[PDB]
Amino acid sequence: QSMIPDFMSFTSHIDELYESAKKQSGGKVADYIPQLAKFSPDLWGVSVCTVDGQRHSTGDTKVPFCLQSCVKPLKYAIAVNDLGTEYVHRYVGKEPSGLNKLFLNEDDKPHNPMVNAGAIVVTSLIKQGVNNAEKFDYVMQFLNKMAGNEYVGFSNATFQSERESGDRNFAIGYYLKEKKCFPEGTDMVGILDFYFQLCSIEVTCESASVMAATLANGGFCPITGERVLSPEAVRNTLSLMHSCGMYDFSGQFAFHVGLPAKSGVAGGILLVVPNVMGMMCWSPPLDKMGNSVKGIHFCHDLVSLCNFHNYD
Amino acid sequence: QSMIPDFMSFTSHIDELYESAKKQSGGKVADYIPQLAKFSPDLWGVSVCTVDGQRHSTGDTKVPFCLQSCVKPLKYAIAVNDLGTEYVHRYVGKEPSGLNKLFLNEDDKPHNPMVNAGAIVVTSLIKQGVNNAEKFDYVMQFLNKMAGNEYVGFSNATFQSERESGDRNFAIGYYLKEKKCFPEGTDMVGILDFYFQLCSIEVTCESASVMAATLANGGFCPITGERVLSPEAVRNTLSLMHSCGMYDFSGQFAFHVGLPAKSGVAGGILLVVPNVMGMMCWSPPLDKMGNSVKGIHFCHDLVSLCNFHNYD
Amino acid sequence: QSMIPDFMSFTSHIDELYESAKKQSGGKVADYIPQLAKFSPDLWGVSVCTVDGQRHSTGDTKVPFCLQSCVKPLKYAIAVNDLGTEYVHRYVGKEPSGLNKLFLNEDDKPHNPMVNAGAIVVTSLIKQGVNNAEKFDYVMQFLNKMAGNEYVGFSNATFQSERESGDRNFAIGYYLKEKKCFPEGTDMVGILDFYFQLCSIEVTCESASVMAATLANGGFCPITGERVLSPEAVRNTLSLMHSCGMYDFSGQFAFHVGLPAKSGVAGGILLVVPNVMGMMCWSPPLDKMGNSVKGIHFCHDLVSLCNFHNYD
Amino acid sequence: QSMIPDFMSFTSHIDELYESAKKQSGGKVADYIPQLAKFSPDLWGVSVCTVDGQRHSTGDTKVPFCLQSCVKPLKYAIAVNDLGTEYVHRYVGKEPSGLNKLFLNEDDKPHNPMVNAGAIVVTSLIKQGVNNAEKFDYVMQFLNKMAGNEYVGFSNATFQSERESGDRNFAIGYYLKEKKCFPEGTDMVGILDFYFQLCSIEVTCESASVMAATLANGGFCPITGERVLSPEAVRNTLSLMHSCGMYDFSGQFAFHVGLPAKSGVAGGILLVVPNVMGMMCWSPPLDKMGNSVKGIHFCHDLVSLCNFHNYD
């Protein structure tokens, strides 16, 4: 409950950590598509939004960037919220996979919602029946509520490039169709289209931190008081972000940082400190694992300083 | 050189083995598409064609059926014949894979030409540049020469069903595209189309046995004297049929039968006894491994009786 | 901080859950050795020990049983406590493995301290230099402090049976020696002996719950006020128990229960509710995964009722 | 039947190939034990022994060296010869494994007799009941018959070093014991001892080539006319040498050379040309795969020149 004693002083520490992370210039900006290669390796922003509704930003916190995989926890939350744990998990697993890297697990289901095959299946469960345009509007609405109506855009350029370039996602798409992993009567190619769109949704560190804070606040948006996601949805999302949100670094991350988080190839890291605050770190240069270098650094420092680790 | 002493007497033994195999009624006729489910489980034919040009058939040896995977050795032979060992193998491996069942190997190449991913890549190497209609005519011509101009048809029904149903081959198709496994400028979807057509080519035990005899005769068609395939092509094809031609039964088959062979889901088994004869066994009911039950039985008996095993 | 409002009332709920679990009669009592087969499938005990020092038991909470794998978290805590995170992890990983089931990971290290290969390596790090008798006394002392000097015995019968029967642990032992996984100059066979002894240490639900409470209390024994383990040791142990403490059920467990726990083939389940209490459930009949049936049931019920899940 | 036209001229070609291979100075002499590191990288010998009984040697063909893995085909032949295909294969598989590298396969049996786990199991089947000294004498006798009584020694130094250093073979030993892979009442540690001895048996290129010729001659020693191995034994051995005799190079070897062969860490390569001749190439420097560099080179050249490939 009693988060941080003095928020203003906490703010001062965020800035120090931010400054320290700024010195980390390693990594490479994703470049499989021009829309990602465009970004400057020097962009670096950190936005905080407590359960209180208190805000604080430092760095490039108003420059829009694509959620990419950061959207995975979000659409999963939405699915559980509208369909419940039981139904959703008839189509997707609940744990980290081994590491080469099969699309399905022992039961012919994607290992979890945080890997592509999983996110693709989860995408096929949301608002079934209506057209893609409607489904897309539906999720945008949902993301707006989580962000307390702050910035939520869309990158058509990214969407177009992701589609006419995601051969691997199509491989996954057909494979899942082959294994009957989708709900009866699913238009697979149409689902991949919806999936590419969701990955192309844009946010800023500021609006994203509010989304994170909503998850940190048991499903209530810290700046509107509104209930956006069901308790069940939030807990599931957090559990999976804890164990599968940082790609191949998930294990190390859970051990050293101990916080629910989710990274994206755009350089973002959606971080959550349960009952305390939500955060969004962003910096285009990624490491071998695919996580934002400055972001990973900052997260370690934050936990070592404020003792935020799940088991402190 | 000195094959079998008396061919007429050998013929009498073929009939006995054929009759013995006829008692084996186990297995299930493939049924993932209606064109295969249609077949009667009782169809059973065995055609022999020696290096001499001597023929002999017993059973349903004139009922057309699709080559399916039996065409894999054949198109591979063609590729090596027109492009040479070195070039072809820049795109496909030369050995059996482990067993779950990755599309690519350590070097991002399909393990060998006998598995789907391999056959698909091999298909992309033949007669590059021309349209599919032309490529198809080209291979048909080639198959005719191997069969000494005997029956070589095409099943449009099978082709159509294979296409609008091969989700797994499409998964493989996109995956290979993703890993840059095809030659520069390959139209992947167009290649899968050519691949489905090749699998739909029809033969009879009689015309197929002539094809096998051509491979048994170092590349010369036993009934026309013509050189159809280069020595290099024939040896490669035989080596791979020896180790990867019977799906997951390849190991057992190489150990107990010791002959170059290739099975197909239609129930066919293209068998080759180097410098002696070519054969084609056919019977729709397959076992767990996917091989023709009567066919597998007959092959074991043939080797136990005539001591045809590679190492006798 | 504010654990449960009224402990006496909480006690009443424990008894209800205990009674409910009692109806679950499935599973099989381990029987690879007679010392385990001896146990009655009806034994069922649950002991609670809060951070306050408040106690409560129900069922067979005074019948001694072997820790078996339950000792893994405990000796790991000890290693980190005396050697620090960095040193210990030069020899053992920090995450769940895939699932067949290799002894080592990508870096030739046991995946984590909760699997046999890991526990064996961890065992080789404790009190290096002294003889086994001394090492054993050292750990017993440590376990006594964690249990606030309550019951901590030893089963010579189990120890003897485990040794002259653990062919697989010996396979692991030699393999690790082969891969130079032990500290310079380690007597491998001697280490396996120490390992078998540690698995043979006996506790009761009551003394074990105190051990769990010590971990729940940041390293301080709830009934002596003494500092037994360093904060670093406790946090590491808890993180790994969260992700690797329930064998192949770890994933499901982390998702549905969300609590640090560790099971043992004797039927015990060391459970920990951070900053609230420690617990020890015990019931010999195990499920396919190897976890106590009644124990697994009880744990699910406890979290569904008291909302103890890490992310509630 | 009609091997090579003129043997004397063939001899002249062997010398040319031998000379050509001599220029290949790559590779590293095994050095996990001093008894192997001792060898000069320049040693290079090639001995030929036809089915006729005609001999020819070039290079260091009288310098003794350990069979090491070259003994695997030989003891397997012996097992099949005394127990028959059926019995032997209740304990060991018949095919190449995948590639990390599990000790057992799907049925809990070593994949084949050519890998360590397999050879160890095969070793436990020979002359059961008698003591190791007797078993050893028994196999020595057998090897003498295959070598037409030519050089067959023993390296006690190698044996001692292999034992007090084969941690991995012990891991395999205990693992197999754990999976009940040995015949009822097998003294596992005693079997590993017999296994280390068999690997320490010494031969020269000359005596080994005679052993190979015996296999090439359907089980009859070319220089004594005696029947040493049953036809069944020889065919099985050859089939497995064809597919599993060159470690991880087996696939490539079967494709490009197409001859039954078996390599050893001492630098030897037991080669067999069915119904023509037996050979033994030896040169201490091995490649990444573990095969003799000069040996591999020579074998390729031999087949390209004399068209000895199984499918020429």
Side-chain angles (χ1 to χ4, degrees), chain A residues 1-3 5-312, chain B residues 1-3 5-312, chain C residues 1-3 5-312, chain D residues 1-3 5-312:
Chain A
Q1 204 294 312
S2 162
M3 319 124 61
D6 172 47
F7 176 86
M8 208 299 288
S9 190
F10 170 65
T11 268
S12 189
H13 284 109
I14 294 298
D15 300 318
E16 284 190 60
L17 295 171
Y18 166 100
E19 222 67 59
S20 186
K22 197 176 182 181
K23 302 174 181 180
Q24 237 52 53
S25 54
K28 185 173 74 62
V29 180
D31 65 1
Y32 64 89
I33 53 168
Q35 290 62 36
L36 284 166
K38 287 187 175 185
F39 294 78
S40 162
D42 299 312
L43 291 164
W44 172 218
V46 173
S47 297
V48 171
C49 177
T50 74
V51 174
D52 256 304
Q54 302 179 59
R55 317 285 289 280
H56 179 67
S57 299
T58 305
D60 314 304
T61 64
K62 284 191 173 64
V63 186
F65 62 82
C66 289
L67 276 168
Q68 287 297 357
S69 285
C70 289
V71 73
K72 288 175 168 55
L74 308 183
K75 53 188 167 179
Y76 168 72
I78 297 170
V80 173
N81 181 89
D82 302 342
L83 310 164
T85 298
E86 205 280 315
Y87 177 89
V88 171
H89 287 283
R90 292 178 194 168
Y91 309 90
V92 60
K94 316 169 178 169
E95 43 197 300
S97 72
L99 56 176
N100 201 69
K101 189 159 64 181
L102 311 173
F103 299 164
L104 300 188
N105 71 14
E106 181 183 61
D107 308 297
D108 291 297
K109 293 182 191 171
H111 303 82
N112 63 73
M114 302 316 144
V115 296
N116 292 4
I120 289 177
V121 166
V122 173
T123 300
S124 82
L125 308 176
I126 296 172
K127 218 66 181 178
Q128 298 171 53
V130 311
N131 57 64
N132 275 14
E134 207 169 309
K135 289 181 179 172
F136 185 88
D137 296 325
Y138 181 72
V139 175
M140 281 296 248
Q141 247 89 301
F142 230 127
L143 297 184
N144 280 313
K145 302 206 63 185
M146 287 183 254
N149 284 301
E150 294 201 10
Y151 193 93
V152 178
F154 176 70
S155 174
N156 184 60
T158 300
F159 164 56
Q160 293 302 329
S161 290
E162 288 290 0
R163 223 206 319 195
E164 291 102 75
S165 163
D167 294 308
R168 182 161 178 282
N169 287 313
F170 275 88
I172 293 175
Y174 280 104
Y175 196 62
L176 297 169
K177 182 180 174 189
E178 213 285 318
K179 293 298 182 180
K180 308 296 174 184
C181 298
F182 294 112
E184 183 79 25
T186 284
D187 175 359
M188 189 279 282
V189 168
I191 291 299
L192 285 185
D193 233 45
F194 181 28
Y195 172 80
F196 289 133
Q197 290 168 352
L198 294 178
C199 294
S200 298
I201 287 177
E202 296 188 319
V203 300
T204 56
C205 290
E206 283 165 27
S207 58
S209 73
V210 175
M211 292 178 175
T214 298
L215 295 173
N217 193 48
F220 292 90
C221 179
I223 68 178
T224 66
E226 288 191 354
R227 176 191 280 298
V228 186
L229 295 167
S230 70
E232 180 195 1
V234 176
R235 183 187 38 174
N236 290 8
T237 300
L238 295 181
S239 293
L240 297 169
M241 275 170 68
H242 176 82
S243 60
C244 321
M246 304 301 290
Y247 302 128
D248 286 317
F249 196 69
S250 302
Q252 298 279 152
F253 196 81
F255 182 89
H256 293 288
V257 181
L259 289 176
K262 186 74 196 80
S263 59
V265 75
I269 296 185
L270 192 71
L271 185 69
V272 179
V273 184
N275 310 301
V276 183
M277 59 179 219
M279 277 189 39
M280 174 52 106
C281 300
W282 175 63
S283 187
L286 317 170
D287 61 19
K288 284 47 169 288
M289 312 275 88
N291 306 313
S292 171
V293 171
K294 299 191 186 74
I296 290 296
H297 191 93
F298 178 82
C299 285
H300 278 66
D301 274 34
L302 179 71
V303 171
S304 290
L305 182 76
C306 309
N307 302 312
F308 277 163
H309 191 299
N310 191 198
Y311 299 125
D312 271 328
Chain B
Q1 204 294 312
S2 162
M3 319 124 61
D6 172 47
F7 176 86
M8 208 299 288
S9 190
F10 170 65
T11 268
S12 189
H13 284 109
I14 294 298
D15 300 318
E16 284 190 60
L17 295 171
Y18 166 100
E19 222 67 59
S20 186
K22 197 176 182 181
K23 302 174 181 180
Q24 237 52 53
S25 54
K28 185 173 74 62
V29 180
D31 65 1
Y32 64 89
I33 53 168
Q35 290 62 36
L36 284 166
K38 287 187 175 185
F39 294 78
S40 162
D42 299 312
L43 291 164
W44 172 218
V46 173
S47 297
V48 171
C49 177
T50 74
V51 174
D52 256 304
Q54 302 179 59
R55 317 285 289 280
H56 179 67
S57 299
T58 305
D60 314 304
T61 64
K62 284 191 173 64
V63 186
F65 62 82
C66 289
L67 276 168
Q68 287 297 357
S69 285
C70 289
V71 73
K72 288 175 168 55
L74 308 183
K75 53 188 167 179
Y76 168 72
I78 297 170
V80 173
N81 181 89
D82 302 342
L83 310 164
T85 298
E86 205 280 315
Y87 177 89
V88 171
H89 287 283
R90 292 178 194 168
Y91 309 90
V92 60
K94 316 169 178 169
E95 43 197 300
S97 72
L99 56 176
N100 201 69
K101 189 159 64 181
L102 311 173
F103 299 164
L104 300 188
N105 70 14
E106 181 183 61
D107 308 297
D108 291 297
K109 293 182 191 171
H111 303 82
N112 63 73
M114 302 316 144
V115 296
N116 292 4
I120 289 177
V121 166
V122 173
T123 300
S124 82
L125 308 176
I126 296 172
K127 218 66 181 178
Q128 298 171 53
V130 311
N131 57 64
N132 275 14
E134 207 169 309
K135 289 181 179 172
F136 185 88
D137 296 325
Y138 181 72
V139 175
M140 281 296 248
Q141 247 89 301
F142 230 127
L143 297 184
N144 280 313
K145 302 206 63 185
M146 287 183 254
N149 284 301
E150 294 201 10
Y151 193 93
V152 178
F154 176 70
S155 174
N156 184 60
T158 300
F159 164 56
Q160 293 302 329
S161 290
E162 288 290 0
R163 223 206 319 195
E164 291 102 75
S165 163
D167 294 308
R168 182 161 178 282
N169 287 313
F170 275 88
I172 293 175
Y174 280 104
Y175 196 62
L176 297 169
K177 182 180 174 189
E178 213 285 318
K179 293 298 182 180
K180 308 296 174 184
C181 298
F182 294 112
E184 183 79 25
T186 284
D187 175 359
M188 189 279 282
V189 168
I191 291 299
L192 285 185
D193 233 45
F194 181 28
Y195 172 80
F196 289 133
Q197 290 168 352
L198 294 178
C199 294
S200 298
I201 287 177
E202 296 188 319
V203 300
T204 56
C205 290
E206 283 165 27
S207 58
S209 73
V210 175
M211 292 178 175
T214 298
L215 295 173
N217 193 48
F220 292 90
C221 179
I223 68 178
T224 66
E226 288 191 354
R227 176 191 280 298
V228 186
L229 295 167
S230 70
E232 180 195 1
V234 176
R235 183 187 38 174
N236 290 8
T237 300
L238 295 181
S239 293
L240 297 169
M241 275 170 68
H242 176 82
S243 60
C244 321
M246 304 301 290
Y247 302 128
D248 286 317
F249 196 69
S250 302
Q252 298 279 152
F253 196 81
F255 182 89
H256 293 288
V257 181
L259 289 176
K262 186 74 196 80
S263 59
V265 75
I269 296 185
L270 192 71
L271 185 69
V272 179
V273 184
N275 310 301
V276 183
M277 59 179 219
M279 277 189 39
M280 174 52 106
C281 300
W282 175 63
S283 187
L286 317 170
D287 61 19
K288 284 47 169 288
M289 312 275 88
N291 306 313
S292 171
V293 171
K294 299 191 186 74
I296 290 296
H297 191 93
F298 178 82
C299 285
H300 278 66
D301 274 34
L302 179 71
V303 171
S304 290
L305 182 76
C306 309
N307 302 312
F308 277 163
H309 191 299
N310 191 198
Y311 299 125
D312 271 328
Chain C
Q1 204 294 312
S2 162
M3 319 124 61
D6 172 47
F7 176 86
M8 208 299 288
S9 190
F10 170 65
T11 268
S12 189
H13 284 109
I14 294 298
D15 300 318
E16 284 190 60
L17 295 171
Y18 166 100
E19 222 67 59
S20 186
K22 197 176 182 181
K23 302 174 181 180
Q24 237 52 53
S25 54
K28 185 173 74 62
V29 180
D31 65 1
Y32 64 89
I33 53 168
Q35 290 62 36
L36 284 166
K38 287 187 175 185
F39 294 78
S40 162
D42 299 312
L43 291 164
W44 172 218
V46 173
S47 297
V48 171
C49 177
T50 74
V51 174
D52 256 304
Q54 302 179 59
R55 317 285 289 280
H56 179 67
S57 299
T58 305
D60 314 304
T61 64
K62 284 191 173 64
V63 186
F65 62 82
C66 289
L67 276 168
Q68 287 297 357
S69 285
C70 289
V71 73
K72 288 175 168 55
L74 308 183
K75 53 188 167 179
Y76 168 72
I78 297 170
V80 173
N81 181 89
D82 302 342
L83 310 164
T85 298
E86 205 280 315
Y87 177 89
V88 171
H89 287 283
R90 292 178 194 168
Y91 309 90
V92 60
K94 316 169 178 169
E95 43 197 300
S97 72
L99 56 176
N100 201 69
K101 189 159 64 181
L102 311 173
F103 299 164
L104 300 188
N105 70 14
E106 181 183 61
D107 308 297
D108 291 297
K109 293 182 191 171
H111 303 82
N112 63 73
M114 302 316 144
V115 296
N116 292 4
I120 289 177
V121 166
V122 173
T123 300
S124 82
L125 308 176
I126 296 172
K127 218 66 181 178
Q128 298 171 53
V130 311
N131 57 64
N132 275 14
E134 207 169 309
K135 289 181 179 172
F136 185 88
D137 296 325
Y138 181 72
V139 175
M140 281 296 248
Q141 247 89 301
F142 230 127
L143 297 184
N144 280 313
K145 302 206 63 185
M146 287 183 254
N149 284 301
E150 294 201 10
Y151 193 93
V152 178
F154 176 70
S155 174
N156 184 60
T158 300
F159 164 56
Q160 293 302 329
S161 290
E162 288 290 0
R163 223 206 319 195
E164 291 102 75
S165 163
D167 294 308
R168 182 161 178 282
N169 287 313
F170 275 88
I172 293 175
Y174 280 104
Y175 196 62
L176 297 169
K177 182 180 174 189
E178 213 285 318
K179 293 298 182 180
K180 308 296 174 184
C181 298
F182 294 112
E184 183 79 25
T186 284
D187 175 359
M188 189 279 282
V189 168
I191 291 299
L192 285 185
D193 233 45
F194 181 28
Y195 172 80
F196 289 133
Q197 290 168 352
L198 294 178
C199 294
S200 298
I201 287 177
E202 296 188 319
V203 300
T204 56
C205 290
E206 283 165 27
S207 58
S209 73
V210 175
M211 292 178 175
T214 298
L215 295 173
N217 193 48
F220 292 90
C221 179
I223 68 178
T224 66
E226 288 191 354
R227 176 191 280 298
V228 186
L229 295 167
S230 70
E232 180 195 1
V234 176
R235 183 187 38 174
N236 290 8
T237 300
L238 295 181
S239 293
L240 297 169
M241 275 170 68
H242 176 82
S243 60
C244 321
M246 304 301 290
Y247 302 128
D248 286 317
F249 196 69
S250 302
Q252 298 279 152
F253 196 81
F255 182 89
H256 293 288
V257 181
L259 289 176
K262 186 74 196 80
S263 59
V265 75
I269 296 185
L270 192 71
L271 185 69
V272 179
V273 184
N275 310 301
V276 183
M277 59 179 219
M279 277 189 39
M280 174 52 106
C281 300
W282 175 63
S283 187
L286 317 170
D287 61 19
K288 284 47 169 288
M289 312 275 88
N291 306 313
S292 171
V293 171
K294 299 191 186 74
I296 290 296
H297 191 93
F298 178 82
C299 285
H300 278 66
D301 274 34
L302 179 71
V303 171
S304 290
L305 182 76
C306 309
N307 302 312
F308 277 163
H309 191 299
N310 191 198
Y311 299 125
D312 271 328
Chain D
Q1 204 294 312
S2 162
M3 319 124 61
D6 172 47
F7 176 86
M8 208 299 288
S9 190
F10 170 65
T11 268
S12 189
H13 284 109
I14 294 298
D15 300 318
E16 284 190 60
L17 295 171
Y18 166 100
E19 222 67 59
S20 186
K22 197 176 182 181
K23 302 174 181 180
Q24 237 52 53
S25 54
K28 185 173 74 62
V29 180
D31 65 1
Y32 64 89
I33 53 168
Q35 290 62 36
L36 284 166
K38 287 187 175 185
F39 294 78
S40 162
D42 299 312
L43 291 164
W44 172 218
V46 173
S47 297
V48 171
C49 177
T50 74
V51 174
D52 256 304
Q54 302 179 59
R55 317 285 289 280
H56 179 67
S57 299
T58 305
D60 314 304
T61 64
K62 284 191 173 64
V63 186
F65 62 82
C66 289
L67 276 168
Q68 287 297 357
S69 285
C70 289
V71 73
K72 288 175 168 55
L74 308 183
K75 53 188 167 179
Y76 168 72
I78 297 170
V80 173
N81 181 89
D82 302 342
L83 310 164
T85 298
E86 205 280 315
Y87 177 89
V88 171
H89 287 283
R90 292 178 194 168
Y91 309 90
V92 60
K94 316 169 178 169
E95 43 197 300
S97 72
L99 56 176
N100 201 69
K101 189 159 64 181
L102 311 173
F103 299 164
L104 300 188
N105 71 14
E106 181 183 61
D107 308 297
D108 291 297
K109 293 182 191 171
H111 303 82
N112 63 73
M114 302 316 144
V115 296
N116 292 4
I120 289 177
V121 166
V122 173
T123 300
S124 82
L125 308 176
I126 296 172
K127 218 66 181 178
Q128 298 171 53
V130 311
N131 57 64
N132 275 14
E134 207 169 309
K135 289 181 179 172
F136 185 88
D137 296 325
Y138 181 72
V139 175
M140 281 296 248
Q141 247 89 301
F142 230 127
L143 297 184
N144 280 313
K145 302 206 63 185
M146 287 183 254
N149 284 301
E150 294 201 10
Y151 193 93
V152 178
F154 176 70
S155 174
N156 184 60
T158 300
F159 164 56
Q160 293 302 329
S161 290
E162 288 290 0
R163 223 206 319 195
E164 291 102 75
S165 163
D167 294 308
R168 182 161 178 282
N169 287 313
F170 275 88
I172 293 175
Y174 280 104
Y175 196 62
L176 297 169
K177 182 180 174 189
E178 213 285 318
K179 293 298 182 180
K180 308 296 174 184
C181 298
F182 294 112
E184 183 79 25
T186 284
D187 175 359
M188 189 279 282
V189 168
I191 291 299
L192 285 185
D193 233 45
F194 181 28
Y195 172 80
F196 289 133
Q197 290 168 352
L198 294 178
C199 294
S200 298
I201 287 177
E202 296 188 319
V203 300
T204 56
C205 290
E206 283 165 27
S207 58
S209 73
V210 175
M211 292 178 175
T214 298
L215 295 173
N217 193 48
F220 292 90
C221 179
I223 68 178
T224 66
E226 288 191 354
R227 176 191 280 298
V228 186
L229 295 167
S230 70
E232 180 195 1
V234 176
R235 183 187 38 174
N236 290 8
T237 300
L238 295 181
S239 293
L240 297 169
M241 275 170 68
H242 176 82
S243 60
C244 321
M246 304 301 290
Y247 302 128
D248 286 317
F249 196 69
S250 302
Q252 298 279 152
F253 196 81
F255 182 89
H256 293 288
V257 181
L259 289 176
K262 186 74 196 80
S263 59
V265 75
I269 296 185
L270 192 71
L271 185 69
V272 179
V273 184
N275 310 301
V276 183
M277 59 179 219
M279 277 189 39
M280 174 52 106
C281 300
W282 175 63
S283 187
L286 317 170
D287 61 19
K288 284 47 169 288
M289 312 275 88
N291 306 313
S292 171
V293 171
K294 299 191 186 74
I296 290 296
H297 191 93
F298 178 82
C299 285
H300 278 66
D301 274 34
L302 179 71
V303 171
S304 290
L305 182 76
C306 309
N307 302 312
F308 277 163
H309 191 299
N310 191 198
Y311 299 125
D312 271 328

